[PDB]
Structures are given as structure tokens and as C-alpha cells.
Write a protein that binds this ligand. Structure first.
Ligand SMILES: Cc1cc2nc3c(=O)[nH]c(=O)nc-3n(C[C@H](O)[C@H](O)[C@H](O)COP(=O)(O)O)c2cc1C
Ligand SMILES: Cc1cc2nc3c(=O)[nH]c(=O)nc-3n(C[C@H](O)[C@H](O)[C@H](O)COP(=O)(O)O)c2cc1C
Ligand SMILES: C=C(C)[C@@H]1CC=C(C)C(=O)C1
Ligand SMILES: C=C(C)[C@@H]1CC=C(C)C(=O)C1
Ligand SMILES: [Cl-]
Ligand SMILES: [Cl-]
Ligand SMILES: [Cl-]
Ligand SMILES: [Cl-]
Ligand code: NA
Ligand code: NA
Ligand code: NA
Ligand code: NA
Lengths: 399, 399
């Protein structure tokens, strides 16, 4: 059915429908698909779903000139720990990704691979089964008691990365980025958000290190910036973006309760702008808004009202993608896109509306999503959400 | 005469005219007199002007419940270097300050002493004459070529402070703060703005140190925060505020051209909020706006449009005084004071309008200022600017 109480607004008269260039890509509008893990990849080997993934992305690529950021993709086995999320390290994986990228390009849209390392959010038992470590920045603070216990039970205690192991992850980020471009992707997004490994280094709750990778703002940002620099060198700044969630609490990050949190993220933004002014500007910075501090809470819940991401704009002068509870709030989007370098990521409602962009332009009702199938090994709740026309035929304008 | 093309707005219907408590003081409105050096203090001994200073402050205290921050006052001879700016270290000085504070209190207004250390902005020849060093954070970067040359000519080269000398300044800040309170002041403002010594430590252009007082965000902020902590301990957080100018370029500070500048100031704000949450909240933070990056340029000149101070509000949760080209822009003030913890400092037009607060409430014309007498050893351009009524009697409503 359609979302019951929603009052749509046509946004076609706003900058959401003005073209913009991101990296090498001429986008025709500024509604971006942010990275959305869907758990349809198949075990063993973290293989993109051979039955449905092409169709899923094809559907969501249907509006010409749409920027799509893929579901998070693990850069290596050690970076993973979820059996049904895909990787980008193996030939068997890239065969499937190639088909996906080709399909998106056939629809005249674009695709950026999000590169992921899980750190403490991984399942320590899956990792132990596969002979892999359970990694984080530190070894004396844990995501939650359950994760700490799963780790101990698996004889796979949380491990504070050595410098050599950080270097190994950086090598894997580089090779994953290369693999992505070679298979036909338009670029990559470095995931440094939502409490995964890089965010675990950025955040002083999760990073109690006393070496050069913790204990100060500069040190906590070191790993993220080393990945940025390694990928810029490998595939070019125009093919690299970075995702950050300054106010996020998901996966036991600090959020606004940490009084140094804005400084930590302002420092990262400043270092990106420094690189930009020196000739290597990232394609974009992608921010999760304080509107959504945890993306598994219903829209309107977990909103942090004590901070804004606007500070980033005083520092970083390139494109900014903002995501978090914008589908249900065209009135907010209307104001945000008045800034001419702002794009809007629409997550959950892109799950349920393959033709979301048309609906935003034209002020059409939105399909309700079904959170129960966000993660599921099924075509149902993945490729069977209808377009607006299909929904009319099903009688949804009267259900 | 009145400012010719100005279109006043009555601001009495805004929060500018709602009472607010700052430290121990119940202000009746939120128009603050920011610190304004006037150079009427007499040599030798940096003595507040025995003829005119009481009258100057009395005039500007006339609206009941006004917060006045004094002209900058040197904490010690070594902290000074301008013969006609006052100090707060000697009995002879405090005799005069006592009269000033009494007069302000008789008008039912309040007075906060701004505590100043000049660093590289001092005149090295005055300092050499008096057997004093020419100090800054570093010794290999200079304010400008003229200052570097004056220093060499005076055989008083710019000197990078030792840790012991920093500790000595902190002792002097403490004693100056005590002197101020004992003489009757309501509080003190730590000057960490406008390119004076503390700002010289904060800014990476002027601070190339490699000890614990430079080389990182935390290190560059160390001196400012040590002064904050020393004064909070000495006279209480409710009697201490801090002034910062993130985007200032006056006295060869970096401003927005330094991509790490927001991070540097976000860190300071965060550390203040941390202290506040731990039970010691400063009375206020005072910000110079990017509206005025150099206060000796005519209003509208030297505006930096590439940054905002709004970030501070995501971090620091106490009162914020904002200053910079607000007198000529009631339309901007009207929007800013919608935030209920925002006060507005009015500098240059408080020089020329002793009854500025009435004029803001009632939407009256403003007396033009005469910049030539901003710094002058005279009552003229100091205590002879008329109130609105006096100006009407002089025929200014038709001049
Ligand atoms: C099912 C689901 C999967 C997600 N997967 C990812 C992901 O792989 N990488 C990522 O950075 N964010 C991920 N997110 C966060 C979203 O990209 C987005 O920031 C968030 O859902 C808020 O936007 P929205 O309110 O428009 O959904 C996910 C969110 C959901 C609900
Ligand atoms: C003549 C003059 C003297 C000033 N003296 C000081 C001072 O002693 N301490 C300080 O922090 N700022 C000082 N300032 C800066 C002002 O406090 C204020 O930030 C600036 O003038 C911008 O506000 P305005 O546009 O309302 O004048 C001075 C400015 C002027 C023009
Ligand atoms: C498996 C992933 C790559 C994660 C899924 C859920 C969220 C919120 C991410 O940021 C990544
Ligand atoms: C002599 C002083 C205390 C200075 C005068 C001019 C400015 C802009 C200050 O900040 C302090
Ligand atoms: Cl799993
Ligand atoms: Cl903005
Ligand atoms: Cl002088
Ligand atoms: Cl604000
Ligand atoms: Na099927
Ligand atoms: Na789950
Ligand atoms: Na006289
Ligand atoms: Na002068």
C-alpha cells in the first residue's frame, strides 16, 4: 500500500531536478541511492545474488542519470563477517558485479561501489569458522555485551589492529577499488560511517589506542585519511567519495554526547579541503544527517536535535550528499537543495519505490516499505515492489 | 550627524529586549558593549584616564541592565606594549577602575574586564624601553615586516615563550582576574581573539612550536584552556567568559584560508562544553563574526562569506555573544536573536551612540562615528557624542 498519511510535494521545481556532475558522471537529478545492505548475497563466497541482484539494480536505475551507491561490499574475507553481504575481492564476485554495472549503465545511470570493513560489527563466530580475526581499533571496549560474549565463546577475542594489519587493510582497499573500476564501476565510496571499522578509529569511545592511530583528533583520523590517500593515488580523486556520520550512534558510536565530535569531523573535512586545494578534490562527501542516528529506527525516532551537519559546508567546498529521513519530508528537501552543491540520498524509500525519482518530481504517493524483508534471502521485498503505475493497477490509490 | 542612508528598525519586539542572566548578572536586554580599546589611558603606568573614563562608561551604562565588557586591559607590563591602553596589575590602575565600576553599577548595569596579552601585536620598542621581551608563540614567523624590523632595531627580537614564561603569564592572568573582582567587576573576559597572544597560540600560522603548546589542535589550544582553567579555579566559572574570532585575519591570523580553522575552534568549544557538563560552565562564549574579519575596515569590507560561526552552537550549549557589523543590520539581528541564548555585541556604534540601546529598541537614527578619534588622547570623540535627544537639539534630524 501507499504510506497513509503522507502529503507529497512535487519537487520538480527545485534544484533536486537540476543536473550536476559528480566525479566523471553527469547526473540528471540530485536524488541519490545511498548504500543499502540487503543480504541477498549467497554463501559461500559472499557472491552477489545470481538470480535477483541485476533486476534489483536495473529497477532502481530506471530514471536516467541517477547516481547509485551500491550496498556495502567487503574488501576481503577479513573485512567481512556477514555471510549474505557481497564482497569485491574475488573473480566469482566480480562476474556478478560486472552484470550489475552493465545493467545500470544500460539504463543511463551510474554506480559507485561502497567499500566496507566491519570491525567490531562483524560476527566473531562466522570469522572464527573461516579462520579470521575479530578486529577493531582497540581491545578493551566492545560494541555490546553480546558481541563480546560471542567473541569469547568463539575463542576469537576482539583484537586491536597492529600497524601492519592496518597496512594490510589499506592494500585490500586499494585492490578492491581497482577491482570495482575494472569491472565497470564509475567510482567507489569509502565507508567511514555508521560505526564500522573506520568509524571505530574516528570515535574516541571505540578508539582508546595510544599509538599514532589514536589519542588525538589527528591520530583518530589517520586510518580514514590513509585510505582516502591510497585510493586517490590508485584510481584518482574523481573516482573517490567518503561517507561520514558525525552524529551517528549506531554500532555504539558516540554521537553528540561526545563534545569533541564536531571537532573530529571538522578536522576530516578540513583535511579533504586541503587536498582539494592542492589539486585532488574528492568527488563528494556523503553525510548521514542527525535526523537519523540509527537507521533501524522508524523515521522520526532517534533524531538528534542538538547538532547540525551544516558546519561541513564552511570547510569542505565540494559536493555534499545528505541522507536521513528525507523521503517523508519534501519540505525539508526543498530548503536543503537551495544550496547548489547539495544532493539528497533516499534510502528506505528507494527500497520500496523503484521509481522514486519520478514520484519525487511529480509529487506522487510513496509505497510503504516492509522492514521485515530489508534483510531476507528473497525476491519478495526486493524486486517485487511496484512502480506507481503498477501500484495503481493493484488498486493502491484506494487501499 | 546621523548615518545618512540607514533605515532603522525597532527591535523592541524581538528577543534583543528579553532579559537574560549572564554569570551573576540579570541583564535587562541582550545588546552588549563588546571590548573597545580607546587609548585614553595615561603614561606612565597605563592608568585608566583620570579625567574622562568614568564619564565614558557612565554614558554607555545609561540603559539599565546593560552588560559592558571593558576595553582590553593588560594583565602585566610584559603583557602590554601600548602606552595608552590600561592595565589591571597596579594599585594606581585599580583606584581608577574602582571608580569606573562603581559608576556603571550606579546606573544599574554590569561590567566585565577583558584581560589582554598582546604577543606579537605589541610595539617592540616600547617593550625594550621598559626592559621587557617581545613575545609570541614562535620566533620564526612575524606579524609583518615592519614589526620584525622594529624588533631588530630595538635589539628586542621576537621571542618564543618558554613553558616557564607561559606559566608566568598564567599567574598574571590569575592575579589580574582577582584584582578585577576585588575592585568590583562582575567578571572577566579572556581575550583569545583578534590575533593577540592566545590567538597566536591557537593559529597554525603563528604557532610553529613542536613542544606541547603547538603542532596539533589540542596542543595549540593548550594555553587558552590553561588560562580558562586557572581563572575558573581562582574566581569561579560564573565570572569567566572567553572571546574567540575563528575567521579573523586581523594581526596576521589565518582565517578561513586555513582549512583546519573550524576544527581548531570546534575543539575549544567542545572542551568548554565538557567542562560545563562536569559542573563548570563558563558565563559565556563571545564570538567575532566572519562579518568583520578586521575591525578597522569599514562595515561591509573584509567580510568572509565562506564560513559561519553557527557550528559553535552544535557544540557549546551556553550563552553566545556575537559581534560584527550588526548595528547597520537590524534585519540580521532580528533573525539571530530568535535563538534564545544569543546576545549581540555592538562595537563601533556604541562608540558613537551612548544611548544605543534606546535607539535599537525604538528604531531611531544612529550617530555616525568618527574613526579618526577611535584612538586619541581626547574627550572629543569619546564623551561628546550626543544622545538622540541631544542630537535633535543640534538639528541632526535635518543635517
Ligand atoms: C536496510 C538498510 C541497509 C543499509 N545499508 C547501508 C550500507 O550498506 N552502507 C551504509 O553506509 N549505510 C547503509 N544504510 C544507511 C542508509 O544508507 C541511510 O543512511 C539511512 O537508511 C538513512 O536514510 P533514509 O532515512 O533515507 O533511509 C542502510 C540502511 C538500511 C535501512
Ligand atoms: C576602536 C576599536 C577598538 C577595539 N578594541 C577591542 C578590544 O580591546 N578587544 C577586543 O576583543 N576587540 C576590540 N575591538 C573589536 C570589537 O570588539 C568588535 O569585535 C568589532 O569592532 C566588530 O563589531 P562592530 O562591527 O559592532 O564594531 C575593537 C574594535 C574597534 C573598532
Ligand atoms: C553490512 C553493511 C555493509 C552495513 C549494513 C548496515 C549499515 C547501517 C551500514 O552502514 C553497513
Ligand atoms: C589594545 C587592545 C587590547 C586591542 C585593540 C584592538 C583590537 C581589535 C583588540 O582585540 C584588542
Ligand atoms: Cl551472517
Ligand atoms: Cl549550509
Ligand atoms: Cl604606544
Ligand atoms: Cl545557530
Ligand atoms: Na527467482
Ligand atoms: Na540483522
Ligand atoms: Na576635561
Ligand atoms: Na594605531
Amino acid at each position: 500500500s501507499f504510506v497513509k498519511d503522507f502529503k507529497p510535494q512535487a519537487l520538480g521545481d527545485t534544484n533536486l531536478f537540476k543536473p550536476i556532475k559528480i566525479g566523471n558522471n553527469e547526473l540528471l537529478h540530485r536524488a541519490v541511492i545511498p548504500p543499502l545492505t540487503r543480504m541477498r548475497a549467497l554463501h559461500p563466497g559472499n557472491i552477489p545474488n545470481r538470480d535477483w541482484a541485476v533486476e534489483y539494480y536495473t529497477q532502481r536505475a530506471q530514471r536516467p542519470g541517477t547516481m547509485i551507491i551500491t550496498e556495502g561490499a567487503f574488501i576481503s574475507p577479513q573485512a567481512g563477517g556477514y555471510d549474505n553481504a557481497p564482497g569485491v575481492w574475488s573473480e566469482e564476485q566480480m562476474v556478478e558485479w560486472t552484470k550489475i554495472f552493465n545493467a545500470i549503465h544500460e539504463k543511463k545511470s551510474f554506480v559507485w561501489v561502497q567499500l566496507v570493513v566491519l570491525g567490531w560489527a562483524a560476527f566473531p563466530d562466522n570469522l572464527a569458522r573461516d579462520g579470521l580475526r575479530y578486529d577493531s581499533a582497540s581491545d578493551n571496549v566492545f560494541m555490546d555485551a553480546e558481541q563480546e560474549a560471542k567473541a569469547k565463546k568463539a575463542n576469537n577475542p576482539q583484537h586491536s589492529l597492529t600497524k601492519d594489519e592496518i597496512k594490510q587493510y589499506i592494500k585490500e582497499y586499494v585492490q578492491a577499488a581497482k577491482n570495482s573500476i575494472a569491472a565497470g564501476a564509475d567510482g567507489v565510496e569509502i565507508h567511514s560511517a555508521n560505526g564500522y571499522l573506520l568509524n571505530q578509529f574516528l570515535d574516541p569511545h571505540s578508539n582508546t589506542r595510544t599509538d599514532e592511530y589514536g589519542g588525538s583528533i589527528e591520530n583518530r583520523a589517520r586510518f580514514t585519511l590513509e585510505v582516502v590517500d591510497a585510493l586517490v593515488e590508485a584510481i584518482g580523486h574523481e573516482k573517490v567519495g567518503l561517507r561520514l556520520s558525525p552524529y551517528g550512534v549506531f554500532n555504539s558510536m558516540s554521537g553528540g554526547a561526545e563534545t569533541g565530535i564536531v571537532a573530529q569531523y571538522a578536522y576530516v573535512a578540513g583535511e579533504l579541503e586541503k587536498r582539494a586545494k592542492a589539486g585532488k578534490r574528492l568527488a563528494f562527501v556523503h553525510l548521514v544527517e542527525p535526523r537519523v542516528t540509527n537507521p533501524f529506527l522508524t523515521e522520526g525516532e532517534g533524531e538528534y536535535e542538538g547538532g547540525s551537519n551544516d558546519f561541513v559546508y564552511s570547510i569542505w567546498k565540494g559536493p555534499v550528499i545528505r541522507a536521513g529521513n528525507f523521503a517523508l519530508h519534501p519540505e525539508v528537501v526543498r530548503e536543503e537543495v537551495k544550496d547548489k552543491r547539495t544532493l539528497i540520498g533516499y534510502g528506505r524509500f528507494f527500497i520500496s519505490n523503484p521509481d522514486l525519482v519520478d514520484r519525487l518530481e511529480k509529487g506522487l504517493p510513496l509505497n510503504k516499505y516492509d522492514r521485515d524483508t530489508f534483510y531476507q534471502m528473497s525476491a519478495h521485498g526486493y524486486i517485487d515492489y511496484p512502480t506507481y503505475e503498477e501500484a495503481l493497477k493493484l488498486g493502491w490509490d484506494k487501499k
